[PDB]
């Protein structure tokens, strides 16, 4: 059961995540199947949250169960806007 | 040698023979004393250099040199060894770290006091 | 036997020049000839003729030196102050196109053999190819 | 803490008058002024032909004392400059220069560098706004180095800055005595400096 989630690549008091596709059984920060975005929980930069929308909309088409927070960020970037 | 030979034989690596096998190459090693005599230097020198047969925790019994001008080492005094040839008196390949264990630091030493383990004179 | 034919010629050349001879012959081998074409075209040897000594195909090579000099030792300067064999049998030297040596900041050549023929370093780097690094010269 | 002790003493160990005190190091009394020989009870004695190393060792110390920097700091910069693209010798120079504690003195807000340092470490300086207490802090081209509003009105800044009016500055620096602003235009070229040092040697000292 593969999941779209966050992998903390920050530092002490300087978190930075990487939205990723990966088998839920791997360790949080281990080898992943693919990176599809990166969120900066503190907006230290004008561009604190980007996310490949195509790849996302794809891994979802086959399972990639997004954790709650993973989903939120994917959402807040129109992964789910179906206009 | 011909190239073929090298391909056949090949060059040989040179291993380094340690000068301080008082084990584990550990920076230091401690031991208890046994004999604490004095010895005469090799030519062209003279004096009564202070030595000591030490029984190490590495199972060895080697003779370590006691630096400084005065010591308080007797029969079963425990002490820390540290390697360092003593050019003259052969057979001696290690030094006694002073200021550690029953090996007090030299007194009134004011210069290279870091060695010989003497605290800093409080200076009035 | 004659262990390495080319390495032989490059020497017969080297030697013949240190004594400052007019020419010097060598056994005839096409590959040797092709090598000469390069030495010829580069201003290392005035050229080579196909003379037949004793009724055996040879290659008279005409050597070129410099001009007489001043002070002690008036001996001319060599045009070929160096010609060293590289890929020799029992250790062949093969180079890719991006590993073809710049012989002395370009003042020398490097006759190497490619499947596009026998060319100099520049020539084959131009044609973009590699091969058996026959030798160097400068 | 960067050194901190007898200064108009090194002045006279490098045989060159390192204006390390600003005024007094400028006017008759820099110590180098009447006592050029080295310190200690052996200074006046003749000197022995310095060794190839001996020399590069001084030629470095000279350059390093000029900026009052620590070896620890000096090394990094040099190693960084050795990596950076271009003639390492100058790039090293124009980098020592880009130091706030230096550009500050170069702009004049302070007389010497030791004083120029204290100004920064006490918050008396601003880079494009926002305070900065990092003497080392890199000053990039275009950055404006002014004096904190809350300190523009200070007993020292006055005299030092008043003393400017008229006095010009490097073909890379530009002032504004008015509000006490200043701008880092260009990174000084080897040419723009009049350093009594042959950087070429300090290279050859680490190239050791």
């Amino acid at each position: 059961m593969v999941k779209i989630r966050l992998a903390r690549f920050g530092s002490k008091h300087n978190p930075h995540y990487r939205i990723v596709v990966t088998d839920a059984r791997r360790k949080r920060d281990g080898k992943y199947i693919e990176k599809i975005g990166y969120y900066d929980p503190r907006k230290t930069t004008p561009d604190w949250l980007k996310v490949d929308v195509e790849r996302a909309r794809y891994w979802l088409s086959v399972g990639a169960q997004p954790t709650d927070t993973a989903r939120r960020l994917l959402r807040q970037a129109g992964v789910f806007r179906q206009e | 040698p011909t190239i073929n030979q090298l391909v056949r034989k090949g060059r040989e690596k040179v291993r380094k023979k340690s000068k301080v096998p008082a084990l584990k190459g550990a920076p230091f090693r401690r031991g208890v004393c046994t004999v604490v005599r004095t010895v005469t230097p090799k030519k062209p020198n003279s004096a009564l250099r202070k030595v000591a047969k030490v029984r190490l925790t590495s199972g060895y019994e080697v003779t370590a040199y006691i630096p400084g001008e005065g010591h308080n080492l007797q029969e079963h005094s425990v002490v820390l060894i540290r390697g360092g040839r003593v050019k003259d008196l052969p057979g001696v390949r290690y030094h006694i770290v002073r200021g550690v264990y029953d090996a007090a630091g030299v007194k009134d030493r004011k210069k290279s006091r870091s060695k010989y383990g003497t605290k800093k004179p409080k200076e009035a | 036997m004659l262990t390495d034919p080319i390495a032989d010629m490059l020497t017969r050349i080297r030697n013949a020049t240190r004594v400052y001879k007019e020419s010097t012959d060598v056994p005839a081998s096409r590959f040797k000839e092709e090598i000469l074409r390069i030495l010829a075209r580069e201003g290392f040897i005035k050229g080579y003729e196909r003379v037949d000594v004793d009724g055996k195909p040879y290659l008279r090579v005409y050597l070129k030196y410099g001009p007489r000099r001043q002070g002690p030792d008036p001996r001319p300067e060599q045009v070929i102050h160096h010609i060293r064999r590289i890929s020799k049998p029992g250790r062949r030297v093969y180079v890719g196109v991006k590993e073809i040596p710049r012989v002395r900041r370009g003042l020398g050549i490097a006759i190497l053999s490619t499947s596009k023929g026998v060319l100099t370093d520049r020539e084959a780097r131009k044609l973009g190819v590699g091969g058996e690094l026959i030798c160097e010269v400068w | 803490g960067r050194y901190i002790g007898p200064v108009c003493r090194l002045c006279r160990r490098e045989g060159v008058k390192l204006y390390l005190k600003g005024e007094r190091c400028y006017s008759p009394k820099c110590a180098m002024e009447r006592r050029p020989y080295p310190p200690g009870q052996h200074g006046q004695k003749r000197a022995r032909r310095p060794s190839d190393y001996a020399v590069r060792l001084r030629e470095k110390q000279k350059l390093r004392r000029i900026y009052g920097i620590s070896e620890r700091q000096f090394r990094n910069l040099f190693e960084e400059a050795s990596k950076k693209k271009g003639v390492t010798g100058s790039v090293f120079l124009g980098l020592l220069e880009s130091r706030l504690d230096n550009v500050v003195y170069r702009l004049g807000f302070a007389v010497s560098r030791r004083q120029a340092r204290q100004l920064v470490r006490h918050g008396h300086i601003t880079v494009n706004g926002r305070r900065v207490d990092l003497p080392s802090y890199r000053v990039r081209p275009g950055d404006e180095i002014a004096v904190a509003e809350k300190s523009r009105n200070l007993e020292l800044i006055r005299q030092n800055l008043e003393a400017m009016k008229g006095r010009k500055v490097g073909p890379w620096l530009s002032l504004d005595v008015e509000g006490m602003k200043g701008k880092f235009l260009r990174l000084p070229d080897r040419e723009d400096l009049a350093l009594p040092v042959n950087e070429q040697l300090v290279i050859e000292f680490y190239s050791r």
Partner: protein, 104 residues
């Protein structure tokens, strides 16, 4: 791509099997001089067809027995027993180099 190698049958004494010796030329990693190095594989001869001496193309196959993961794909050239010689003679060479010398 299932690895296909070319070699020479040097043993047919096995049932439905053959020892195939395969050579591989190449520049030596440190001294350059190109060197020959060989390895033999035990190939599968389903209908005891290929006989000693033949030159065959061995192909990466599914396990047949411990040490024997290759089947004989086809025959390139036939019975050149000259190659088998270089081999048998070498092994026969081993005869010496022992405890009480041997023979040349």
């Amino acid at each position: 791509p299932k690895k296909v190698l070319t070699g020479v049958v040097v043993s047919d004494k096995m049932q439905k099997t053959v020892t195939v010796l395969v050579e591989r030329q190449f520049p030596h990693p440190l001294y350059g001089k190109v060197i020959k190095r060989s390895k033999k594989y035990l190939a599968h001869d389903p209908e005891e067809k290929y006989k000693l001496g033949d030159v065959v193309e061995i192909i990466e196959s599914r396990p047949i027995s411990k040490r024997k993961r290759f089947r004989v794909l086809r025959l390139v050239e036939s019975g050149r027993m000259d190659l088998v010689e270089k081999y048998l003679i070498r092994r026969q060479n081993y005869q010496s180099l022992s405890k009480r010398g041997g023979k040349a």
